[PDB]
Amino acid sequence: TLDDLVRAVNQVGAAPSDLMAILQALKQAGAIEGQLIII
């Protein structure tokens, strides 16, 4: 799940918190079967 996305994060320098913004793009594209909750 995140494992592939974490590797994509680790490819570039970026930051481990850049994954939070990748999910929002996936949510907008309808690529998530679930609920994205921000606490």
Binding site: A21, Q28, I38
Partner: protein, 207 residues
């Protein structure tokens, strides 16, 4: 290319909601703008704390923002949509903030959603909330009316309009779809709303 990939159903539209709100819980990266302080004072009056006139709140963890949401078609009360939160004052950053209760108004001036939640910012003055707005009202739709449905091409072209008409006619039968201009294609559809959804499901997947 599927029909649903390159076309949209006429009458099945999105709506844009806009509202004003305050973002709290900022690590000292708030504002001191007169409108921010005025809104903060009004909000505090709404909870039973009314400062004497001319009192400067000296707030540093609150920022005034503009909240925007797009209401998808067939949006029902209780659903949640994304909101974009952008600072309009002089706050340095909205990172780590919390959007307080803000009412999102339509183009007719009525409230259709209420937005709260936690901001996720990367530009530090624009953040997003994944389920910030809860839909509170419905917008009527002309989808179930009439004896036909209409497809609007994303990229207008006479040949694409005619080829989509032929695709429907080959699948269903003769004299079923017709291109009325370079953008729109009209397909005859059942009168029952449940049958029209079942009908549109088969048609929107045509290649």
């Amino acid at each position: 290319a599927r029909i649903k990939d390159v076309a949209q159903v006429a009458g099945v539209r999105s709506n844009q909601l806009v509202g004003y709100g305050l973002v709290s819980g900022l690590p000292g990266t708030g504002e001191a703008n007169p409108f921010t302080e005025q809104s903060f004072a009004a909000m505090l009056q709404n909870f039973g704390i009314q400062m004497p006139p001319g009192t400067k709140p000296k707030i540093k963890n609150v920022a005034a923002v503009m909240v925007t949401a797009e209401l998808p078609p067939f949006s029902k009360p209780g659903q949640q949509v994304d909101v974009t939160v952008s600072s309009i004052g002089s706050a340095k950053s909205l990172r780590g903030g919390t959007l307080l209760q803000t009412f999102l108004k339509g183009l007719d001036g009525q409230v259709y959603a209420v937005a709260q939640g936690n901001l996720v910012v990367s530009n530090p003055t624009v953040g997003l909330i994944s389920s910030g707005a809860t839909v509170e009202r419905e917008i009527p739709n002309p989808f179930g009316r009439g004896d036909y449905i209409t497809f609007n091409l994303l990229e207008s072209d006479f040949t694409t309009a005619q080829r989509m008409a032929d695709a429907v006619n080959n699948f269903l039968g003769p004299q079923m779809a017709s291109a009325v201009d370079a953008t729109s294609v009209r397909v005859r559809a059942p009168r029952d709303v449940s049958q029209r959804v079942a009908f549109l499901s088969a048609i929107e997947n045509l290649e």
